[PDB]
Amino acid sequence: TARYHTQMLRVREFIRFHQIPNPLRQRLEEYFQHAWTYTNGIDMNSVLKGFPECLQADICLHLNRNLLNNCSAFEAASPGCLRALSLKFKTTHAPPGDILVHKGDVLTYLYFIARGSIEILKDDVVMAILGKDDIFGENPCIHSTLGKSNSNVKALTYCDLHKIHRDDLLDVLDLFPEFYDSFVNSLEITYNMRDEEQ
């Protein structure tokens, strides 16, 4: 079922949806020919993950530069600080029908919607969020305690999401504490998920 050409063209559609440098684009293609699995066909991120350390790095790096280079919260980050961020940011492709966060869950990640449409539900739909580059979660830099969700988060369509872990974010501000004012001031959480009725 999972023949070479099948996988060859999913790969083609990644670079597709994610406008990718040729210097890497060729390196990935050459790695996928000189290696590919009939079993681990990887509808999405399976053998996509199965690549050597080197190549997955530039991807994350390039995917992150997207958010980092255009979102206004990161206006003002020193290149040192940007490098730190672009290193600890993660990217996730969510399939329609999928719960990123549940009602109690600790607010562990902060999310930026690249593409697609998220629904946030409290038993029923309290809001619809999108790759306007909407942001949901809490800003860990302002609260002394760790928040808890207050709601559920489903992918309505397929979604691209940039997520950073609070401690990575906190660590970055520890190293570049001078970024704190502009970040606190420029970060526009679209849907605040901190349960403030708890």
Query: Obtained via which technique?
Result: X-ray
Q: Write down all domains in the chain, each with its CATH number in brackets.
A: 1-51 (no CATH), 52-197 (2.60.120.10)
Using alpha carbons, select from 53, 121, 40, 130 the residue that is nearest to residue 94: 130
Lay out the sheet containing 125-130: strands in order across: 99-101, 152-155, 117-121, 125-130
Instruction: Give the containing element (helix H, strand E) for 153.
Output: strand 152-155
Tell me how far apart the alpha carbons of residues 86 and 64 are, in angstroms, rounded to a whole number: 6
Helix and strand totals (H; E) in the chain: 6, 9
DSSP code of 178? G
Residue 88 CB burial class (10 angstroms; 0-12, 13-18, ≥19): middle
Q: What's the longest Cα–Cα distance across the chain?
A: 55
Tell me how far apart the alpha carbons of residues 15 and 17 are, in angstroms, rounded to a whole number: 6
Contact (Cβ atoms closer than 8 angstroms) between residue 63 and residue 21: no
Using alpha carbons, select from 66, 88, 105, 80 the residue that is nearest to residue 169: 88
DSSP code of 144? S
Q: What are phi and psi of 146, to 5 degrees?
A: -95, 125
Sign of CA dihedral 194, 141, 146, 96: positive
Q: Rounded to the nearest 10 degrees, how much is the dihedral formed by the CA atoms of 22, 160, 139, 151? A: -170
Tell me how far apart the alpha carbons of residues 145 and 132 are, in angstroms, rounded to a whole number: 29
Q: Which residues contact 120 (CB under 8 A, 6 or more apart)?
A: 126, 127, 128, 129, 136, 151, 152, 153, 191, 193
Using alpha carbons, select from 192, 191, 188, 190 the residue that is nearest to residue 72: 188
The β-bridge partners of 121 are 125, 152
